[PDB]
Nucleic acid binder design. Structure first.
Ligand SMILES: [Mn+2]
Ligand SMILES: [Mn+2]
Ligand SMILES: [Mn+2]
Ligand SMILES: [Mn+2]
Ligand SMILES: [Mn+2]
Ligand SMILES: [Mn+2]
Ligand SMILES: [Mn+2]
Ligand SMILES: [Mn+2]
Ligand SMILES: [Mn+2]
Ligand SMILES: [Mn+2]
Ligand SMILES: [Mn+2]
Ligand SMILES: [Mn+2]
Ligand SMILES: [Mn+2]
Ligand SMILES: [Mn+2]
Ligand SMILES: [Mn+2]
Ligand SMILES: [Mn+2]
Ligand SMILES: [Mn+2]
Ligand SMILES: [Mn+2]
Ligand SMILES: [Mn+2]
Lengths: 98, 103, 97, 79, 96, 105, 79, 97
DNA sequence: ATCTTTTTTTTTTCACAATCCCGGTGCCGAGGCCGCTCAATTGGTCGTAGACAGCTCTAGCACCGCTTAAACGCACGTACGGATTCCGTACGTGCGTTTAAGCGGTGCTAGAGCTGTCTACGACCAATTGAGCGGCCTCGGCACCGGGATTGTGAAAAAAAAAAGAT
DNA sequence: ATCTTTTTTTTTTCACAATCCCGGTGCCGAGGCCGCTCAATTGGTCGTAGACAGCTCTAGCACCGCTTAAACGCACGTACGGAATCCGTACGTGCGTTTAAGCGGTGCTAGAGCTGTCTACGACCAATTGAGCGGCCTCGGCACCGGGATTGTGAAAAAAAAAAGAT
């Protein structure tokens, strides 16, 4: 057969995705999630196609940008694997969590 | 036109409208719009200068959001001006932490 | 069909683009970002200037308030050049009255 | 159930753009929880801007205005 | 001479104080903070309401803008109570 | 009821608030309910914080509210703390908080 | 060389209020560097206000308007 | 005669200073620094004494706040001791750099 | 200590991945022209914002002597961070099967968005007056201090319970 | 299977170091009284912002059925995380000596901040005109793709070095 050592493909994906700018979350599952959350605030709403896209561009920017800071917290603890506690530290320090 | 009087491409008349219109003050001086149009023209130029260089690196004649992102984030002073700004379809700078590379 | 007018800075961004780089264009998405950029800073400068006037108990925003805004708002070297292109543009304007 | 539409592989991809190599198995739920808070804070305000304008359609500008409030200004949607 | 008039919120903060704690005092620095607190939130709400109008092509800041602003600006329950306190005062004033 | 404050049932000054809203370049025209609504909001928030600070002042065995009491009052109320999230209160100090791992064993 | 006037024990005190128990010996020079950058940033803007006001005296409101610009608002000195 | 263990007096000091609200930097040392820095931005400036205390209140607030974050980084590394790299991590995530 | 043999770490030598890149090919939005129209411009009137000059006195600065708390620097050794080993399983990789995103399609209309009417609302104004300001004064709250009540450490060791060495 | 030794645990005796809580005492800023003044209130005109109604048609949305690529579930095993241990010194604690911050008291004038005068500038309105708009069109930049050019990865095998054992 053939098998890469674990980490080699992971790194390949990093290079690939930092190179591109396309949205990484599947668009339709995102949209249904947007409309679900919107029903809590006001019932029977509509959404411009671009208005959903604007949300998606801003969620994925946030999240990538969050993972960047999350990774540094793992690295700071001599680790290569991100963990929930890392995300929590990152949000804590940003001023999102208390 | 007031534009050519100052030597600018950016609309001086438009900016003077938008300044009164926008409830910024009771009254607006004659210089203010000219100065502001000029500063706007400059920062546009500065971005397009470095975006244009980005587009040539990626072997593209036409600028796209990425080329703007790459331009802005690689520059130190633009990155600081646009520090809370998300450029749609921009992506990120390629940057892998050293500790993640195989030794 | 029939119309629907919405103003932008798109024609001037082209004019500036052909100055700095004669032989390179721009996609609509990129333009719509530039459009967001010009508008973002407009409000940022003007707002800072508006508060300048208020603090100093003045009714008029003049080029002087725009200059101070630009120094508070833009970073070091980006400010110096912005002041200079400003001051220059006002000087040519008032001498071609 | 919708929240599970943000799938493990999608979340992986995002972390790859973030420059992440290895991902703990608990991450994917914690990510969903964080994304849910984010969208709730943004959409609430967006809808508040839509409420005031007396509409039943959430516009791009409604989203853009709401992101600017939260300090996450977005270029390219009429901003 | 006779120093120029410096306006404040202190006489009102004194009134509101004795309604809630009829024996409690308050130092200069504490009142200087309360003054900055009110002035701050003034500029916040007033500013959001100004934009709300601008977004909707309006030339008038009404209590409707003030209301919407307060919802955007104040967190959950704190917004919820001020909104009823606000509307209650407009209701009473409009009648009389 | 000659004053607008009495007409609205408020301790805060409706007229001054109406002045401030016209002399601040927020909009061309200001609505007659706006400075009533706003004054009431400001009055509401003011009371809430003074409630908690006065409570803080009794716990510390005091008649007088001092910046510390405002700081204790804000930084312990979950919502007040959020509203004043980027807010420095001079002479407030900080809530007593030692991390668990730092305690001896 | 007035930055040394921010003394090791003063910095120690600040860390104590910040809930710190144990302090590396490199922290003190590091902290000085950080402080200097904060003060530079704040003072630069205060002075920019002072000069626009055509004054030769920096007021408290010069500082307070500067601090609000940094997103670091201050209560008890006016404003 | 008598001797406390490492970490006891520190803990005692943490308790002491989380109660108090007084400024922890000595006033004159701070004021010389303020003038020195301000001098290099502009010469022959005078300062309202309340503008110097404004600065000091804002700086101590700032540093206290930072140290809090610096500590949580150190604990995240399974350490009790704060090190420059904890200040640099905190300031990286804060968007100060 | 020296000599061959056995186990661990290091370095090339090879097969094949996945990824560039290069020249062809068609597709749609970049960009140009075109004619109308609405926002910018020009020319004119009116009043008032603020530049400027003259005066006032607040408070920001300099300086000096004395007290004493805080800063400094040095001795000393405990417990903390880091270096090392080491073991289990939670991870990444790569199959094959299952699934719903994506696309291009037609059909139906809620509701966005523009127009034109008009009157309730808010600007602007003079004249009227009492809420809110500074100036003035004082005394009760609290900062400060000493004393004795309380706390909390700490080591010590003294005691008590477990593990280990020994008859 | 028994007795004595050594080590680990886990309380408690006990000074006693440091701090917390107590009334006592003296300084001065919170807060109340006054009366003068300017911003708020009062009633009248007048213009237009915006609510309300009426029409237009954009863009959101719904069900539908193929064609993949992405999601999923699973097998397998390695490299990563964490627990466990060990050593050196960095950083905390405490003391004696040195340094200057803080205090409060005095003396001097820069310049903050307020006034009054007068006019250059900007709001405002009416008339004018071409800069910028949408509508229409077309064609070259670039996305997609297939089939070599080339660039790394991982795996045995070979080589060298390091530990291991035997004369
Ligand atoms: Mn090619
Ligand atoms: Mn034409
Ligand atoms: Mn004037
Ligand atoms: Mn350890
Ligand atoms: Mn479709
Ligand atoms: Mn009316
Ligand atoms: Mn008073
Ligand atoms: Mn005592
Ligand atoms: Mn007592
Ligand atoms: Mn009276
Ligand atoms: Mn209208
Ligand atoms: Mn199953
Ligand atoms: Mn490891
Ligand atoms: Mn003094
Ligand atoms: Mn002078
Ligand atoms: Mn002056
Ligand atoms: Mn003029
Ligand atoms: Mn066009
Ligand atoms: Mn291919």
């Amino acid at each position: 057969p053939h098998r890469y050592r674990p980490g080699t493909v992971a790194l390949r994906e990093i290079r690939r995705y930092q190179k591109s700018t396309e949205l990484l979350i599947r668009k339709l599952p995102f949209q249904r999630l947007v409309r679900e959350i919107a029903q809590d605030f006001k019932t029977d709403l509509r959404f411009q196609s671009s208005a959903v896209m604007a949300l998606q561009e801003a969620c994925e920017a946030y999240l990538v940008g969050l993972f960047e800071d999350t990774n540094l917290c793992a690295i700071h603890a001599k680790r290569v694997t991100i963990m929930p506690k890392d995300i929590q530290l990152a949000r804590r320090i940003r001023g999102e969590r208390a | 036109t007031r534009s050519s009087r100052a030597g600018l491409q950016f609309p001086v008349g438009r900016v003077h409208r938008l300044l009164r219109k926008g409830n910024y003050s009771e009254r607006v001086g004659a210089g203010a719009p000219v100065y502001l149009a000029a500063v706007l023209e400059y920062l546009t130029a500065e971005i397009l200068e470095l975006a244009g260089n980005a587009a040539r690196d990626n072997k593209k004649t036409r600028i796209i959001p990425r080329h703007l992102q790459l331009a802005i984030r690689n520059d130190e002073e633009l990155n600081k001006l646009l520090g809370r700004v998300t450029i749609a379809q921009g992506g990120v700078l390629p940057n892998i932490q050293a500790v993640l590379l195989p030794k | 069909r029939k119309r629907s007018r919405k103003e932008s800075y798109s024609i001037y961004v082209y004019k500036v683009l052909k100055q700095v780089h004669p032989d390179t264009g721009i996609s609509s998405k990129a333009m719509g970002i530039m459009n967001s950029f010009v508008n973002d800073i407009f409000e940022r400068i003007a707002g800072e200037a508006s508060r300048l006037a208020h603090y100093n108990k003045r009714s008029t925003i003049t080029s002087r308030e725009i200059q101070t805004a630009v120094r508070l708002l833009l970073p070091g070297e980006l400010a110096k050049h912005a002041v200079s292109e400003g001051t220059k543009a006002v000087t040519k304007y008032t001498s071609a009255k | 159930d919708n929240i599970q539409g943000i799938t493990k592989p999608a979340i992986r991809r995002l972390a790859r753009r973030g420059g992440v190599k290895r991902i703990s198995g608990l991450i994917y739920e914690e990510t969903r929880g964080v994304l849910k808070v984010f969208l709730e804070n943004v959409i609430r305000d967006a809808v508040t801007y839509t409420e005031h304008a007396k509409r039943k359609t959430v516009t791009a500008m409604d989203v853009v205005y709401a992101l600017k409030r939260q300090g996450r200004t977005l270029y390219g949607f009429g901003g």
